[PDB]
Amino acid sequence: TLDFIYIYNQIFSTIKKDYQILKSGYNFRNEYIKSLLFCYFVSKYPNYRWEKRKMKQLIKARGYELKGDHSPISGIRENDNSWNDPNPNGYNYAYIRAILGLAEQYEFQLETPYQKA
RNA sequence: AUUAAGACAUUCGUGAGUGAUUUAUUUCCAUGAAGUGGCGU
C-alpha cells in the first residue's frame, strides 16, 4: 500500500499477460495458454485458423526448422499437435490477429541461434 | 506752317502665410508524436 512501484509493476504485468492470452497466447516459463482469439475463430462459423500457422508451414516447406520441439496447433483439443492438413481441401486461413492490431512484422526464431526469419 | 507742338498706362509689389497621408484592423482558425510485438506452441 505504501510502495507504488510494486503496485504499478503488478498491474502492468497483469495487463500484458491478459492481452497476450487474448491475442497470441502465453508461452514463457513452462506454461501454455492457447490464444483465445484462435479458439474463438476455431469454434465459430466455418472455421478460420491462424495466419501464423500458414507462415510457419511455408517456412517449414523451404528449409530451416523453427525453434520449439512441438508443432503448430491445428485446433482446440488436448495436445492437438500436427504439422499437416487432412486429405480434403486445406483449412480456411485468415489474418486472425489483425483485428486486434496491425503488427507490420512477425519474428520467427529458427533452430540455430543467431539467425531469425 | 494747318485751332499747332511736346508726353511708354508708368514707379513700387516673392502666389504667400498655418497644414505628420493620417485615424481604425490579432497572420488567425483545424488537427492525439502517435500505431504495433513476435517467436520460444
Side-chain angles (χ1 to χ4, degrees), chain A residues 6-26:
Chain A
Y6 182 66
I7 289 183
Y8 276 162
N9 263 261
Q10 216 212 333
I11 287 180
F12 282 128
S13 306
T14 314
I15 284 193
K16 182 186 169 180
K17 270 195 50 55
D18 294 329
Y19 193 66
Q20 269 192 344
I21 289 178
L22 278 173
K23 199 173 174 180
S24 325
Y26 191 70

Side-chain angles (χ1 to χ4, degrees), chain A residues 51-112:
Chain A
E51 92 279 341
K52 158 187 164 182
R53 166 195 191 76
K54 181 50 66 189
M55 341 198 303
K56 284 175 84 75
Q57 276 185 357
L58 282 188
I59 200 56
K60 179 44 79 196
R62 162 62 46 84
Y64 10 81
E65 309 192 3
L66 305 309
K67 146 162 281 313
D69 37 3
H70 280 141
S71 315
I73 40 178
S74 325
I76 60 61
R77 210 212 56 238
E78 184 72 26
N79 78 342
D80 189 356
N81 218 26
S82 182
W83 260 111
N84 90 10
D85 303 353
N87 79 81
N89 189 14
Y91 308 78
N92 322 331
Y93 291 77
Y95 199 173
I96 287 315
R97 307 213 254 101
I99 46 144
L100 292 182
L102 282 194
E104 86 155 353
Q105 228 186 10
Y106 278 24
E107 210 101 342
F108 275 104
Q109 287 194 1
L110 38 64
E111 79 299 300
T112 166

Side-chain angles (χ1 to χ4, degrees), chain A residues 29-60:
Chain A
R29 269 59 61 64
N30 198 358
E31 186 187 349
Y32 185 47
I33 300 174
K34 281 155 144 198
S35 99
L36 288 176
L37 206 60
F38 178 85
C39 310
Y40 175 71
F41 273 109
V42 152
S43 304
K44 288 278 316 323
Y45 260 137
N47 308 30
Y48 278 125
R49 315 273 204 79
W50 250 351
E51 92 279 341
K52 158 187 164 182
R53 166 195 191 76
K54 181 50 66 189
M55 341 198 303
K56 284 175 84 75
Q57 276 185 357
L58 282 188
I59 200 56
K60 179 44 79 196

